[PDB]
Design a protein around this ligand. Structure first.
Ligand code: GNP
Ligand code: MG
Lengths: 205, 614
RNA sequence: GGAAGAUCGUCGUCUCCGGUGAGGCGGCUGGACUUCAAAUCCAGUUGGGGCCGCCAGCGGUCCCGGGCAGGUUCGACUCCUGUGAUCUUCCGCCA
RNA sequence: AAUUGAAGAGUUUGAUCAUGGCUCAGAUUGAACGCUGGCGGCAGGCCUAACACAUGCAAGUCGAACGGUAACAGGAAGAAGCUUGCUUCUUUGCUGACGAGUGGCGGACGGGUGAGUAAUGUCUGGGAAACUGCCUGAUGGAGGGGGAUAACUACUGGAAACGGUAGCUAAUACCGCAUAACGUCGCAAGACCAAAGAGGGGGACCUUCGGGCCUCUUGCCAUCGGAUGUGCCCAGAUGGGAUUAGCUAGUAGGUGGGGUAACGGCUCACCUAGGCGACGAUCCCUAGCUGGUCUGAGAGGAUGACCAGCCACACUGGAACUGAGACACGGUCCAGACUCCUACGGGAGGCAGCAGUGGGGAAUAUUGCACAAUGGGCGCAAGCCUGAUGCAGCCAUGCCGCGUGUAUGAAGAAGGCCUUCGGGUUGUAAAGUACUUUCAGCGGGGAGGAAGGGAGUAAAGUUAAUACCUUUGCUCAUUGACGUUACCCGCAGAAGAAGCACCGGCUAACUCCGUGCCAGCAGCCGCGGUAAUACGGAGGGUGCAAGCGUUAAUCGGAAUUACUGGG
């Protein structure tokens, strides 16, 4: 299921900071991500429309660590739902549990969130869960199992969380590193860089 | 109590089998049409006692010998019928020679045609047999003179039949089955019948069919006309098996066994026993239990020989087989399997010592194990294949003290220490090859030392060396403790003229190289080593500064949190006059170090001593 | 498996051949070889093996090569017996 | 709340714009093979030969229907063995029980297949001229006799198959008699039609001391019902072919007979000569059909796998009876063909059920466990039976999920490639470092599916009855094939775990070498003529992912049959 291979080389194929690895930094920048993506990256590519739109799809699909087929499922349901597909799609997509574990900050990356959720540590509404794709409902509490507490990783992620600025649409008390989700973010409060409709006509073939 | 009947053709062997068991050995219409035993037939003697002795009647013909060779696998006891009329026949003596070469634990001589001859001929042939037994090195033999049509010797034969051992088998053996007759019965598939060399099987068991290379579930089995849920080695086993395999790929002499064999090898070494010596590199027939092959023999020291097979075959250590002349006529010599993957160039000087160590010195797998360890790393797959070890057998090497086991090959601990010392001497040679290099990395030492050897064994050995403390590493650079990063003079000679130059203003690599007339790559590397020593720091690639200006860079950064409370470029111009490019490269260098950190608008000072008291 | 049959060079096909191996035919590789072809020859199909120096990744030793072995016979690819291998057809695969 | 939804490209010329096909990108499969393959869940799994089948199982059940005791376990008198109350054996349906026998019910359900089949079918909308066993409601009766027969006994045929001969006997079996209209016919008057009991308990009283008698249960017969299902008819709707335009004499109506549970040429007799047809008759080829599945923006197209509905078929051809229900997968009779047995005279059998074997083919599985649960047949019920069903087994065949480890880690290693040989690529990737055991494994703990049912007991009802029986309570123990379930606890170590295709343009993803219109690639336009971005390989990259690629097949693109939507 998981990709398993170097992450930031795929991240530098687009030349973007995909937040695949964090720690002290977000992207190292000093790893020559833009100048030499590959053996022939020294010469600037121009890349046709299918390449830019698909390559962007690659980007977003990688930041959320989803596969193509259930991503297409997210597409078909997004079209099935009433209203704008792009906006409500992205909103529910941010509702994904790994993303929420990331924004609450107890987790170096959404992939680390895959690790910790995979290790049974997460407990939502007094129930254990595994899948990172689950979209938590608004005004729903989530907690980490008390035995997961005390690991050095969680706090060491928390200093990064505070530095990242943390979501405003979610309220994490962090008194027991247990936060409550509030509601799915509106298009205006986020990104202002990715353009979702590219992906939607990209699947209009 | 399996007793296989052998002897020269039409000397009553079938009449004896109908007398004891009353089974009709004939199966194919032709043998019925021709009245001879053209091919092997089976008899069994079920009893209330619950053992069923096995009877195998075989042709005494050389062209038909390939089938008898199919039947000689797994014999518990052999009975050579000899008619008293002519005494021992030449075919009988051939079969006796073949049994002596195969190492059959015991054999019985049964004299027939006794009624037709006068008793004087009985005693005479009895004497002649008892002399021939000594000729062949036979030990115990019980001669029974009988007219089987008359049932004369039956009662005397019975006690001997009960005397015959059934072979025991240890529970720890890899299951191995020699296929004999593959014939579908209309019910339930293939049922292939064959002797089981080792192991037990049940209907739920999966097996591996060789020569078809497919797994096969057991549908059903009959132990010896005795259907049962399980079957043990030491009897003929009808075996009904499922799976993708089909009769067109199936061949007699195919093996059914628990796990996939490594692919068959043509070359093999064998111990020789012979009535007369063999000559080097000559064509001959290899005859093994249910296996016909043609190959050329070669001579090594004395009664040691190398078989070259035209036909690849699955094999295992200490499997006796008979080797006859390529055109037939004569049974000349025996063979035993010893090494299953001989190299080429066997008379070569390093190797003959190794072979004597491998063969004469060790019957047991542990002793051969140590021999091979002195020869080099011993892969468990090849070792377990040669010894036909089961996993319970595999764990015995774990049981042994002093054997280093990584994910495959064992290596003996003192020998591993020898390889350590070799790695040290090689590392010395590399440290000499470049006096100025602090040292090779771990994997690089692996390649510099033992690229052929298993990565787990070698790197584990490196870890043992690190525990010894012979060399200490940091950041993945492996170097001797003695190093102070002083380097080799070839570098220092540049660094002396480079020192004042570096002082009053440090410069870019390409400019440095131009100033001291030194090659760009040489210049870069000498200064990078100088920088590992702590003499110069690159704030960005190819831009090198001194140390005394670095601490000064820290004193200018000192006033930023206290005087401003933010970190911004602006102070580049508002502090010393140092350009924005310079200040930014300084900042990113210190950000990667952790001297400063970057978040949004400003740089933090979480972990350094740059901070002033006030 | 069994019976019978064909074939198994030294690059292939054939004539063969018991006097010491040769030849007809052919494909290809080039040289002599032309604008390419065509042809002619030449040169060549270089074969293997135990062993050697070897990994020399190759090259030699001696020996051998009509599948291999055996015998004639004075002398065998040559006659023949076998031996298998491939190949043709057929007999039965009966716990 | 019940929608939101439709893309193009390449290729005819020297160039253009058209027309026009050809090809590709998409989606999809009951798919197959190639390469690869760690796990789990949920599905699917002879589309070929409706080709042939070893072996076993798949429909039995009721002693509370009847005579019985074959076998077992008690009891009985007796044997009197001896270990003198341990065991010995005889006789004993007399009890529990039930072989076999008669009889009742089921076997016409359920399962399999799509061969036949273009209408006799199916769908939808209807309808009148019928039936509906056991369920359930009402209405009433239910009395009294006779003669055989299986089992059994004796004999006997034949290799066997399967009988035959003579005799005895029971039944809720059969046949009578009696009786019965609110039933049938008859305008009416009149005439006719029914049975069988068994079981449990029981006060008084009879007692041939078997039992009668009282009470209850349920069984039998009669009439009207209900509902359900079934039969029958009608109306259209449901493939292709006109290089099939003629076809029919029982065919179209009549009267009467016969026949159906029922209308009717369903059938016959006789009369009439009609009847069908470009609204495609007749004939021919294809085909099970529908709800639906895939595709599509849509209208439509194709298709009818799984599941459900209806029909049809059970080696082939036919036949008809038993039966409420059949022309009957595992009923009967005849004939045939194919295989088996046979003493050669003559018999036996049918996996298009569960599995399974062979054959066919590119290809599709346990010769499996349990009736624990659901369902079904019989029974008062327990239980008995069940390859229905529930699972399990198998397969990457499909859908879905997870893992094969996150962080930091540059002095940006080695090696490879590429060069201008100066330098960059693989790459924080590795190594290191902090971590981490998901899953797997091991060892333990450990839900629920399981509702009930049985016994006992109380109350209430019934009854002459504190009896039997019925209902409702409560106590007890008990029902698991799955199951070593799910789930959790730990133990430990990244430990058991990434490949496939493609990289000239369509179409996102490049350099060198080898080869030299050769070897070869190729969906299309194309390439390779000694400097191949297209062959083959290397490295590197791109795309999918435990799957990846070609072939096969349908719709789309194709507004390229154009109702929407063409000239
Ligand atoms: N006088 C006598 N003759 C016997 C006796 N037993 C066997 N024979 C002879 O042996 C003949 C049968 O030989 P058979 O048993 O078939 O030979 P076989 O050795 O089994 N054949 P194969 O060696 O190929 O297996 C008979 O015809 C008979 O003449 C015996 O006891 N006495
Ligand atoms: Mg014999």
């Amino acid at each position: 299921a998981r990709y398993l291979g170097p992450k930031l080389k795929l991240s530098r194929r687009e030349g973007t900071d995909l937040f695949l690895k964090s720690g002290v930094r977000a992207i190292d920048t000093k790893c020559k991500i833009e100048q030499a993506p590959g053996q022939h990256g020294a010469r600037k590519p121009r890349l046709s429309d299918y390449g830019v739109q698909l390559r962007e799809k690659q980007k977003v699909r990688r930041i959320y660590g989803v596969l193509e087929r259930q991503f297409r499922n997210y597409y078909k349901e997004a079209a099935r739902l009433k209203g704008n597909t792009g906006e409500n799609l992205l909103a529910l997509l941010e509702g994904r549990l790994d993303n929420v574990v990331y924004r609450m900050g107890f987790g170096a990356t959404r992939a680390e969130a895959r690790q910790l959720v995979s290790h049974k540590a997460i407990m939502v509404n007094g129930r254990v869960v595994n899948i990172a794709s689950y979209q938590v409902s608004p005004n729903d509490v989530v907690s980490i199992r008390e035995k997961a507490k005390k690991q050095s990783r969680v706090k060491a992620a928390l200093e990064l969380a505070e530095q990242r600025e943390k979501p405003t649409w979610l309220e994490v008390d962090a008194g027991k590193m247990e936060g409550t989700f509030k509601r799915k973010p509106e298009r205006s409060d986020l990104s202002a860089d990715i353009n979702e409709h590219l992906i939607v006509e990209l699947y209009s073939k | 109590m399996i007793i296989a009947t052998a002897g020269h053709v039409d000397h009553g062997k079938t009449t004896l089998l109908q007398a004891i068991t009353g089974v009709n050995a004939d199966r194919l219409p032709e043998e019925k049409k021709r009245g001879m035993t053209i091919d092997l037939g089976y008899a069994y003697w079920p009893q209330p006692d619950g053992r069923v002795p096995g009877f195998i009647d075989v042709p005494g013909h050389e062209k038909f010998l390939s089938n008898m060779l199919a039947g000689v696998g797994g014999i518990d006891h052999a009975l050579l019928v000899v008619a008293c009329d002519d005494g021992v026949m030449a075919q009988t003596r051939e079969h006796l020679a073949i049994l002596q070469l195969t190492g059959n634990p015991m054999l019985t001589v049964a004299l027939t045609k006794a009624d037709r001859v006068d008793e004087a001929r009985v005693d005479e042939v009895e004497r002649q047999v008892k002399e021939v037994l000594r000729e062949y090195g036979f030990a115990e033999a019980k001669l029974f003179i009988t007219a089987a049509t008359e049932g004369r010797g039956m009662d005397a034969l019975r006690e001997h039949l009960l005397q015959l051992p059934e072979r025991e088998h240890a529970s720890q053996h890899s299951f191995r089955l020699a296929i004999d007759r593959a014939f579908t019965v209309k019910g339930a598939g293939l049922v292939v019948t064959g002797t089981a060399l080792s192991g037990e099987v049940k209907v739920g068991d999966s097996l591996w069919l060789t020569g078809v290379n497919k797994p096969m579930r057991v549908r059903a089995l009959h132990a010896q006309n005795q259907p049962t849920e399980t079957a043990n080695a030491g009897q003929r086993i009808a075996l009904n098996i499922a799976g993708d395999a089909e009769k067109e790929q199936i061949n007699r002499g195919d093996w059914l066994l628990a796990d996939v064999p490594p692919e068959p090898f043509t070359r093999v070494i064998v111990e020789l026993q012979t009535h007369t010596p063999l000559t080097q590199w000559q064509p001959l027939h290899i005859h093994h239990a249910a296996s016909h092959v043609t190959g050329r023999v070669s001579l090594l020291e004395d009664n040691l020989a190398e078989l070259v097979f035209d036909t690849p075959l699955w094999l295992a250590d200490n499997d006796r087989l008979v080797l006859r002349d390529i055109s037939a006529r004569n049974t000349l010599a025996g063979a035993r399997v010893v090494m299953l993957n001989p190299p080429r160039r066997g008379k070569r000087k390093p190797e003959y010592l190794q072979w004597l160590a491998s063969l004469a010195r060790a019957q047991s797998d542990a002793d051969a194990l140590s021999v091979h360890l002195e020869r080099g790393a011993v892969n468990l797959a090849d070792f377990a294949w040669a010894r036909q070890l089961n996993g319970e057998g595999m764990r015995e090497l774990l049981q042994q003290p002093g054997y280093i086991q990584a994910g495959y090959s064992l290596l003996n601990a003192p020998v591993a220490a020898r390889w350590q010392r070799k790695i040290l001497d090689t590392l010395a040679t590399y440290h000499e090859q470049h006096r100025d290099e602090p040292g090779p990395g771990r994997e690089r030492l692996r390649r510099m030392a033992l690229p052929m050897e298993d990565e787990a064994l070698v790197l584990l050995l490196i870890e043992k060396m690190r525990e010894s403390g012979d060399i200490h590493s940091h950041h993945g650079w492996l170097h001797l403790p003695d190093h102070k990063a002083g380097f080799s003079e070839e570098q220092q000679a540049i660094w002396q003229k480079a020192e004042p130059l570096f002082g009053d203003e440090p410069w870019w690599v390409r400019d440095l190289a131009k100033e001291t007339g030194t090659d760009e790559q040489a210049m870069r590397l000498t200064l990078r080593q100088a920088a590992q020593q702590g003499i110069i720091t690159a704030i960005v690639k190819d831009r090198y500064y001194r140390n005394d200006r670095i601490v000064e860079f820290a004193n200018m950064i000192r006033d930023l949190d206290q005087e401003c409370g933010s970190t911004c470029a602006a102070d580049f111009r508002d502090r010393l006059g140092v350009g924005r490019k310079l200040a930014i490269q300084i900042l990113e260098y210190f950000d990667r170090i952790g001297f400063t950190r970057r978040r949004g608008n400003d740089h933090l000072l979480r972990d350094a001593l740059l901070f002033p008291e006030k």
